[PDB]
Amino acid sequence: SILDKLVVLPSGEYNHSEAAAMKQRLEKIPTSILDALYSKGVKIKLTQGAITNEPELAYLKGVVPRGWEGTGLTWDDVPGVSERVVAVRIGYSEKGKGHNSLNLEIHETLHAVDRLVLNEVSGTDEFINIFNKEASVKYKGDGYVSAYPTEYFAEAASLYLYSDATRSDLKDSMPLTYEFMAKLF
Ligand SMILES: [Zn+2]
């Protein structure tokens, strides 16, 4: 599997079974897309501590994420991020673990796929049209998935890839998004 080289586990001590479970869920992403991620120098780092403990993310320590002034939140509290590295904290996959995604590792990986593999497909007129019609169905008022096409892309692709139940739910609730995802994957 491409995941044996794309997924970087900690060199120190880590929760073995949880890291394996996350690695297994990343297999829901098509192999061709994972291959393409690796060719762009992308690494999916599963971290045992705060993502900011990673040398390349240490610069974010004590910095306030945009939109969060006056809340006491810093990047140290954020369980996952996606830039040229995808960093996800081990044990924080489920909704409510410091984020509101269906699955943290799939969600954050799909941002890197959008940016570095698919030429920002979330920003195309076709996807914008879909986002304007359907992002409101499940996410109205969240100022996040319903506010940014990149977020709707990552979360709606997560619904598509995670399980058969979440995909069926997407097909019924957001049919234009389901059609776009099926054509893409
Ligand atoms: Zn996101």
Residues placed in the known binding site for Zn(2+): 107, 111, 144, 151
The CA distance from 77 to 167, in Å, is 30
Number of domains in the chain: 1
Distance CA 81, CA 89 (A): 10
Which of 105, 108, 134, 155 is catalytic? The answer is 108
Annotated binding-site members:
107, 111, 144, 151
Task: Compute the distance between CA of residue 60 and CA of residue 76 in angstroms, rounded to an integer.
Answer: 7
The two tokens of residue 116 are 């570095």
Cα(11) to centroid(ligand 1), Å: 27
C-alpha 157 to ligand 1 mean position (Å): 11
The answer to whether 109 and 37 are in contact (CB under 8 A) is yes
Q: How far is CA 161 from CA 14, 81, 106, in A?
A: 26, 19, 8
Q: Ligand 1 center to residue 46 CA distance, Å?
A: 17
108 assigned to active site = yes
Domain that holds residue 142: 1-185
Neighbour count for residue 136 (Cβ, 10 Å): 15
Residue 143 is encoded by which pair of tokens? 């100022």
- E strands, the chain, in order: 7-8, 43-47, 80-82, 85-89
Q: How far is 185 from 177, CA to CA, in rounded Å?
A: 12
User: 55: which 2 tokens?
Assistant: 């040398």
- Which structural technique was applied? X-ray
Quote the ligand 1 centre to 88 CA distance (angstroms): 12
Q: Rounded distance, CA 37 to CA 94, Å?
A: 23
* Å from CA of 15 to ligand 1 middle: 24
